[PDB]
Amino acid sequence: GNTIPHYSWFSGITQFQKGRDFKFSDGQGVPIAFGVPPSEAKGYWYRHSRRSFKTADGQQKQLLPRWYFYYLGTGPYANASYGESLEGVFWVANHQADTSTPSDVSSRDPTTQEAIPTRFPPGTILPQGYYVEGSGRS
Numbered sequence: 001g002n003t004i005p006h007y008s009w010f011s012g013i014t015q016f017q018k019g020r021d022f023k024f025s026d027g028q029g030v031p032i033a034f035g036v037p038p039s040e041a042k043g044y045w046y047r048h049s050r051r052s053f054k055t056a057d058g059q060q061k062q063l064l065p066r067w068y069f070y071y072l073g074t075g076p077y078a079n080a081s082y083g084e085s086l087e088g089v090f091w092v093a094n095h096q097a098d099t100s101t102p103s104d105v106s107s108r109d110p111t112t113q114e115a116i117p118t119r120f121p122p123g124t125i126l127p128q129g130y131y132v133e134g135s136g137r138s
Contacts, residue, residue, distance in 0.1 A: 002051045004138050006076075008068055009034070009108050010116040011134025012048075013126070015064035020129030022067070022088070027095035028124040031069045034116070036105035042072045042093030043103075044080055067130070068138070069118065073102020 010031065022029075030041045046068040052061035070076070072093065077084070082099050085091045093099045117134035126132065 002049075002053070004048060004050075007108070007110040008070070008115065008138045009105075009113075010069070011118045011136070011138045012066040012068045013118060013130050014066060014133040015130050017129035018064055021127055022090055023127045024090065024092070024125055027093065027097075029090070029092045029120065030094045030124070032119045032121060033071075033105060036071070036103060037096075038094050038121070039096045040098075040103045040105060042097035042099050043070050044072065044075070044077065044084065044091050044093075045086070045089040046070055046075065046077075047088075066138075071103045071105045072097075072099060073104075074106035078102070 033041055048066055048068055050063060050066060052063045054060035115136050115138045118132050
């Protein structure tokens with residue numbers, strides 16, 4: 001039982017190859033939103049381990065981390081200080097973003113809204129070993 005413990009507004013990027021970095025430029029790696037404009041497209045890091053398991057047939061899963069995305073003002077570090085870039089971490093938001101303040105985006109009921117494939121605006125790059133999917137799964 002290694003299901004995501006939370007209901008993210010949308011899915012994450014899917015890793016294919018282990019042991020790679022998370023690299024992008026200013027205002028890149030910002031995930032296209034429902035509800036909130038590029039103007040308030042702004043968030044920070046998050047990552048989950050989705051551990052593998054082995055079944056009756058002796059076959060074990062081989063799987064990789066996923067990258068998870070929360071808006072500024074809401075998240076398990078909702079009130080992170082703007083600039084909190086850690087080891088293995090890269091703080092993000094769009095060039096139009098204020099990022100002096102919690103954003104205008106939160107509060108989604110998964111009763112109505114299931115996970116959505118994550119998409120990033122043209123200009124954003126996919127760090128080596130990753131490419132985004134999010135086929136209705138976070």
